[PDB]
Design a protein around this ligand. Structure first.
Ligand SMILES: NC(=O)c1ccc[n+]([C@@H]2O[C@H](COP(=O)([O-])OP(=O)(O)OC[C@H]3O[C@@H](n4cnc5c(N)ncnc54)[C@H](OP(=O)(O)O)[C@@H]3O)[C@@H](O)[C@H]2O)c1
Ligand SMILES: NC(=O)c1ccc[n+]([C@@H]2O[C@H](COP(=O)([O-])OP(=O)(O)OC[C@H]3O[C@@H](n4cnc5c(N)ncnc54)[C@H](OP(=O)(O)O)[C@@H]3O)[C@@H](O)[C@H]2O)c1
Ligand SMILES: O=C(O)CCc1cccc(C(=O)O)c1C(=O)O
Ligand code: NA
Ligand code: NA
Ligand code: NA
Lengths: 357, 357
């Protein structure tokens, strides 16, 4: 079997990586948990086995076959190249390597083939992008995609464990201490790395990540650029508005597309239902549609509210929901690893394409 | 001065109708409070005065100059025509009369002129429509509008006092008692008058009102139809997705438009800032944008995240927030009443144009 390392084992994604690995078909001979200096020495379970968390260093990756990185952009930038040096194949959850042309950006149901040419690092895309790709790829295959416009409804777990706890504390101060939401103290959301912080309790914050020079946020531009790379078509026009809402887990998206040819709605529904990883949940007569709270804990991506635009001949609207820590991160990553195993791609790279920092 | 009646004085909207009237410039000699048999006989303040609540009936309107209706479509359908017959000017906050060609559907900053031809009933549009109209009218004036795509983020108070209590109770159960959200029992949301009820705590529900036969909800179709009538332009293409989220008050909206002529993005910002009732809150360098929690208690409508679409030349995205009980309901209604008073339009109607039920 393999020696598998989880870098960032102690965080929100880390925890689900462990869970996904525990339930994986990957043959695992040894599991190693890595994090920062301050977690080193603590113990975390793998199944009933006790594992000792190690500090992430340049020399920690010897003997490792597969390393799943979810420790933040800076940690992958610094240590993933040394893992690749050590003969590791790295599946990276962060955004750091995603737009590097030597790095496949993969959703296994859509572009598993891109894995074949990897140079030791595979990037998992953004959570919001992944679930959109699972929903839209079956439509693109049959009728094409001219443009996408998406507005997201993102859970706070996407911003990390600290954001979850800040959200819960805020809500208790409102409901229990009677604090007005506009009077709440905030430290993390909307973005831990930005200058000002705002309450999320009973709010909707139209900012995920920091702002880019064009007045879209980095989250929104990731949806644009990652979509084009995943579906390998820069002509697909993609514009996003990314919004954080008071949901702990599972992202929801209002997705509008225009296809290249007119796609009968009953066929679109059938095509999505037939696509692996996508579940059709669409029966409005019985008020059936995807819901964040029902999606939590499932690897599937749920699609409903499917309907023609009222005016645009080729326009279609839908509602897409998935657990942002499973298909959106930890399951996509483990699924990439299982796919690498299945296709004989877990082996050291010949050449190094990535600088050692 | 006027005798003013508030029909549905005890609910979520009615409490704000009372506050807006208390703060109004309308010369009010007498206030009457009307509700159902359930509240009849109870007491409620207008400023320092105790006012006894009365049952709403066919005969309750003698001597009344202006009646503000916010007690549900059925109540308006049954009683507003009797108020008109009695000589009242009715400002109806429900959907019932909105698409009747004898009824002005008014946002005073946009189409106050339509008030002049009233026949005893003036309809206040849906909250979501109202705030969108305030943001977009200044754009349409200078550059036209071809289409709108909108995804909403709607607060629970829009569905009434019960919805508010249900939301608070659900969140407390999760946060203080450790109930899982998918295990919560719901009785009202997404829609009181539909068959099945789902939890809103840590969820996003893509259903507001009941479904229509084209698979859009009534809330989505109201946005479409009300936009066309308010802007007096059936050629404007409008499709919406309306979603309830865990916010108590203030609706937010991700609005996409395509204008008729290219609309320079900085001039759009200026035009919105210059439009009465609209406040520009847009300085991404300092993370300034409309937020639900900051909008609560203000009559203004706040607009930001204003930016060009990445591909469509005439496309523009923005974020629009307003207190759904103020400008979205009580304040729009009271503003209509003030506008009727100011234009000498508070008088009985000669010809009855509304079916008595
Ligand atoms: N207050 C802190 O800054 C603090 C203290 C202790 C731990 N952490 C980690 O970071 C999280 C704190 O809140 P969060 O919302 O940022 O968590 P998070 O994003 O949900 O998780 C981030 C993960 O990346 C790891 N990590 C961060 N910097 C690292 C580095 N330079 N080298 C190796 N691993 C690194 C963390 O391990 P570590 O837990 O070892 O950092 C953590 O497991 C914890 O969940 C914990 O995982 C943070
Ligand atoms: N413009 C908008 O977007 C907008 C927004 C919100 C609401 N509205 C309209 O206002 C209505 C109520 O809204 P809400 O949020 O205030 O609901 P709510 O909090 O449940 O209040 C319902 C109100 O209607 C009264 N009522 C119910 N049945 C009645 C009857 N048979 N006769 C007389 N009064 C009756 C209630 O009186 P009791 O206390 O005696 O039951 C109460 O005052 C909505 O259904 C809708 O039509 C419009
Ligand atoms: O059930 C009813 O009587 C009306 C329900 C309702 C609830 C919330 C907003 C509205 C509205 O359109 O403003 C409406 C409406 O009047 O149709
Ligand atoms: Na295109
Ligand atoms: Na203004
Ligand atoms: Na006058």
């Amino acid at each position: 079997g393999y020696t598998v390392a989880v870098v960032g084992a102690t965080g929100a994604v880390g925890a689900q990586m462990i869970k996904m690995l525990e339930e994986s078909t990957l043959p695992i001979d040894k599991i190693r948990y890595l994090a920062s200096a301050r977690s080193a020495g603590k113990s975390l379970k793998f199944k009933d086995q006790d594992i000792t968390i190690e500090e992430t260093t340049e020399t920690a990756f010897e003997g490792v076959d597969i390393a799943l990185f979810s420790a933040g952009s800076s940690t992958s930038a610094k240590y993933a190249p040394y893992a690749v040096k050590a003969g590791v194949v790295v599946v990276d959850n962060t955004s750091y390597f995603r737009q590097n042309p030597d790095v496949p950006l993969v959703v296994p149901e859509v572009n598993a083939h891109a894995l074949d040419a990897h140079n030791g690092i595979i990037a998992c895309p953004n959570c919001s992008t992944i679930q959109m790709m699972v929903a839209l790829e079956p439509v693109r295959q049959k009728w094409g995609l001219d443009r996408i416009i998406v507005s997201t409804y993102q859970a706070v777990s996407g911003a990390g464990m600290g954001a979850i706890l800040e959200t819960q504390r805020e809500l208790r101060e409102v409901l229990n201490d009677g604090v007005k939401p506009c009077d709440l103290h905030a430290e993390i959301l909307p973005s831990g790395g930005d200058k000002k912080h705002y309450p999320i309790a009973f709010n909707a914050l139209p900012q995920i990540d920091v702002f880019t020079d064009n007045d879209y946020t980095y989250e929104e531009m990731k949806m644009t650029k990652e979509t084009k790379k995943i579906m390998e078509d820069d002509s697909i026009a993609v514009s996003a508005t990314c919004v954080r809402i008071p949901v702990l887990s599972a992202h929801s998206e209002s997705v509008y597309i225009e296809t290249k040819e007119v796609a009968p709605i009953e066929e679109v529904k059938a095509a999505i239902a037939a696509f692996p990883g996508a579940v059709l949940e669409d029966d409005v007569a019985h008020q059936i549609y995807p819901q964040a709270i029902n999606a939590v804990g499932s690897r599937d991506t749920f699609v409903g509210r499917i309907r023609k635009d009222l005016d645009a001949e080729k326009g279609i609207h839908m509602w897409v929901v998935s657990d942002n820590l499973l298909k959106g991160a930890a399951w996509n990553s483990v699924q990439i690893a299982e796919t690498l195993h299945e296709r004989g791609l877990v082996r050291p790279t010949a050449e190094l394409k990535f600088e050692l920092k």
